[PDB]
Amino acid sequence: GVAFKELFRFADGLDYVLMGIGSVGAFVHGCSLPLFLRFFADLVNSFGSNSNNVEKMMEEVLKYALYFLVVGAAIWASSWAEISCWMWSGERQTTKMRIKYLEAALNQDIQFFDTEVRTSDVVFAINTDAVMVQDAISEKLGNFIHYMATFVSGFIVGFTAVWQLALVTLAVVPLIAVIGGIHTTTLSKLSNKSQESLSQAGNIVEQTVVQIRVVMAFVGESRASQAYSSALKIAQKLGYKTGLAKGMGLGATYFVVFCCYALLLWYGGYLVRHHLTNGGLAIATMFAVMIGGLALGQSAPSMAAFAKAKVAAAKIFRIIDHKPTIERNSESGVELDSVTGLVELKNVDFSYPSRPDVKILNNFCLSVPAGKTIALVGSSGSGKSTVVSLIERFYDPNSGQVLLDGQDLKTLKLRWLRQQIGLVSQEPALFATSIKENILLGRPDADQVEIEEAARVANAHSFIIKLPDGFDTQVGERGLQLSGGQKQRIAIARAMLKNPAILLLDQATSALDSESEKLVQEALDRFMIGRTTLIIAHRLSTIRKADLVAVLQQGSVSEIGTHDELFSKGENGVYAKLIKMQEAAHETAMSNARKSSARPAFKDQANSFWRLAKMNSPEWKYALLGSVGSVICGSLSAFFAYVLSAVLSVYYNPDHEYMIKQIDKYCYLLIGLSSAALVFNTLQHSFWDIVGENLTKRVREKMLSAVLKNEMAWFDQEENESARIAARLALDANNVRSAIGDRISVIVQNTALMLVACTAGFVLQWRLALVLVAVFPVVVAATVLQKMFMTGFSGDLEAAHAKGTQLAGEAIANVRTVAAFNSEAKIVRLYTANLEPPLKRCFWKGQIAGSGYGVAQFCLYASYALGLWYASWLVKHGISDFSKTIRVFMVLMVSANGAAETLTLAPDFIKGGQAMRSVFELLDRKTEIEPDDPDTTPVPDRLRGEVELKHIDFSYPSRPDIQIFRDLSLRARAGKTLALVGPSGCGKSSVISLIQRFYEPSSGRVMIDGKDIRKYNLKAIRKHIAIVPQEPCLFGTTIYENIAYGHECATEAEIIQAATLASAHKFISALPEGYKTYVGERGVQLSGGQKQRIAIARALVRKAEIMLLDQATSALDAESERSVQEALDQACSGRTSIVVAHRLSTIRNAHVIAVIDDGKVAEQGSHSHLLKNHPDGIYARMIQLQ
């Protein structure tokens, strides 16, 4: 909360012009609809009280039908200057704010991102705070002068027209506005209890799409639809009451509005027959208070955005001003002439200023000679990037002088000092630009010639030519998503252009494949010529090429020697322990880097309006009562325009005895047809939600029941991942609710007006009811634009500014890399030119949408001055009179307003969603493997378990390049063991994926008991085969269910004995709730070793003859692994087993051990066989490894 009138601090001379015009021109538009009614009261009062002198009919009406065109045409230059000088004065005060919010955050030291505000929010606050400030300069101030103009002019064309009918009307507007306040709140209670329950029943599909490999493995793909049904039966009983609370919520408006014109239109009839008030002045005074009375009601939402503005701007002015203390522009600095790379650190102690007690650096002493290959290889977790983060002078040391040619870092100029030092971190940084721009961030003023040879030295120039756009390829969201080595070599070239004198490299090839890390070292050795070089490395090749090696120890330099002297010490020194931490990062890198790859016209609406509304036919008895209630509220929207009209004819009758009677009908009917509005308005909106929701639940339970029939190969395809399936069941399920439900209640009750409004037109006077019906399109159009107003034109500016935000998103997040260069003037000048095409676009939407509301409020107030011109032309030529003509006119205009307050009450159909394409694509995709196929040979009794593979070839449809299996055959015998091993990670699990029929082999037969797996019912053949997954994640339920999720039915004693045989029952007996303990992702997270025990407890319940054990290791307990295997000795009692593991002691007693090699078996035998008959193979060497 800064204040008001400090938001406008970026203002200049010209923005004090666009707010003068945006205020006065928004004041003329406010004082119009009051000063239109008094040209309407004075018209009818003169048109209707001269029924004997026809000469004072022409020059009276034609005078006031030229005060409508002026009131018309003065809403060109008062609504093409309000809407088009605030939405352009909120683009010269927000856009100049986002520039200074990036000139004063990237120009701020790193410690500001540590002890002040997080880096998670300063990337957030440029997106969410710099929009809700912009909505309080432009729109919600322009919609606030406009109301106080209507409000004050609501009470001066009011209280001086008629005294005593203004005081009564002002005692009514409370009774309306306090009921419209009940209507807006009690919906918002259910609007946040309903969708919260949908987020409860929205992750129940997320606990199946993520774990699809276990759900489709077992039979239970139906029983995880049985929860998603019953978790939405809650979401109807929070949806049925939404209609019944909106049904009475409109009913208590049409009860008060009718029963407050039973008074104001009686008390008007008391005034005329005591000679105080005419007939124009008693319908004008009645409206001009009920215009200005309710126009104060929308002055609160424009006020509420002046509360969130002044506080969400206060988070931005914290960073704008914010004096630093480190001397970046230190023009009282010194300069050198010839550096040599002489770097020394003496008695340096340093830790972070976030935990000011640690001793990360403790008397650090490094001596770097000029032009060497010195390497800092110490223990992990001992800094090992903070040491790099001081030679750059990110921070400042607590105590100790950092020497550079015998000079301190607190002497030179940082703008000049950072130019000599090149730097490559572990992960590089490339911004959403082209290629040459991401190269010129090192040095600005190089030509094209110096760039092209340098990237060729870095071995990047080859595939840049292979790119289609060359060096103008837009790297970022587009740019065909270059690989990590390709991202690496550009940043290597980004330092080569700079020509540094000192080199700093921290884990260059730590995340690169064996192909490109050779290619990097081909470029590094070219770049390490004659330069002072400090490399923290990852492999021995740099260590062998290292000149001098220093060894850290707990924040202290321990060993200072060479590559050979530290190697000659043997295991006496720490250099042998450096090997112990070396290849721990070698093999775990590209195994896990593989895991990143292994884990990854009107005929369009022809039947989609009809096939959709054909499965919506067990409920026709609830949509032929809500159509009855849509006609009755169709009449009462137009019957009210008749009573208000025909009273206005009674006021000009000189018989004060027909006037007491013929008011006393139109007051008693107005109460008698007020009680039959509230009763028949909770049938129009209540029964069009019981037809509403019971379609929507019937669609959500067919989509998930038809996603789970697609093959496993369908499910990892490009768009079918986890976060994109729940979107197709959240957007497509709710956007299809508003297509059959709303647009029968709207299309009918905007026809029940026309049979009652135009009937009064084509009975009383058949000639006036053509000209009004010909101009009847432009009236109902012009009321929609008065209702698209008050929500503001040009909404949702996230889409117009999502491209420019991405450059500020990556720049703040890379604040060490950006400040490692002097690239803090280009990220300013490139944040500019991502705004200049979305700045001119917001301009020309001002000059178009300003006039598109400008004309359509002139064609309304002109078509009133042509309707009421054809009134006096009939009276002058004796074809009609006053009583029939003004009874026609006000019916056809007040009903015309009542039409347009239907289209903006049930919105979102006029291409509100074309999502009907996305639904029927998903319900009607055809599979190739039917998971429950009728007419198939059944499963026999409890079989011997003959697993056998014959001449099998495989290829994933995601990557059909590499063939996995090349004429592979393998046979499990009648129930002993077929334990398999192999090299190169747990990708070997793609043998189990062939048995489960998750995929299809390229050639061969998958025969079981001499019978193919295409000759069984697929759920029936997935009955007898258990499977332990690799990394078990669990369901957000009880442990008692996750073990009961292993059979069709479940009994108590079967769960208890099996978990005891699983040997997890002990600590389960020591848990707080034990079996009924709530686990998953919403409660107690467990250990990975106990996650293994639950998964093994799952598989034992199946009593499966065939069993497929994946990696049962990484249960870090030598006691438990032996004891579980003792039970696993009994877990194969007459059972066929494939056991796939790592440690050879598990397969020590295995019958048939085989090795995967090049799509073929390598060796066949066991422990006593392959060490006897083929002792020179792979099976003997890995025993010495373990």
Ligand SMILES: CC(C)[C@H](C)[C@@H](O)[C@H](O)[C@@H](C)[C@H]1CC[C@H]2[C@@H]3COC(=O)[C@H]4C[C@H](O)[C@H](O)C[C@]4(C)[C@H]3CC[C@]12C
């Ligand atoms: C026949 C026309 C010449 C007419 C006078 C016209 O100028 C005027 O703009 C009409 C369309 C408006 C002006 C005031 C409006 C009313 C504003 O005050 C009312 O009585 C409110 C009460 C309540 O808010 C209703 O939902 C709308 C309702 C009932 C409006 C119905 C239509 C109007 C009567």
Ligand SMILES: Nc1ncnc2c1ncn2[C@@H]1O[C@H](COP(=O)(O)OP(=O)(O)OP(=O)(O)O)[C@@H](O)[C@H]1O
């Ligand atoms: N503000 C901070 N920024 C970074 N590290 C911090 C900070 N405060 C404390 N630290 C500690 O500094 C340590 C630096 O990490 P570590 O010593 O494991 O090597 P590293 O810097 O991560 O090496 P690399 O970046 O090459 O992986 C962290 O373990 C962290 O606990």
Ligand SMILES: Nc1ncnc2c1ncn2[C@@H]1O[C@H](COP(=O)(O)OP(=O)(O)OP(=O)(O)O)[C@@H](O)[C@H]1O
């Ligand atoms: N879930 C998956 N979907 C599609 N393709 C995959 C999947 N997992 C892995 N792959 C592909 O298979 C390749 C290697 O995984 P695979 O399962 O073939 O291991 P493997 O060759 O059997 O390993 P091993 O050396 O242990 O025999 C990867 O390059 C990857 O592209």
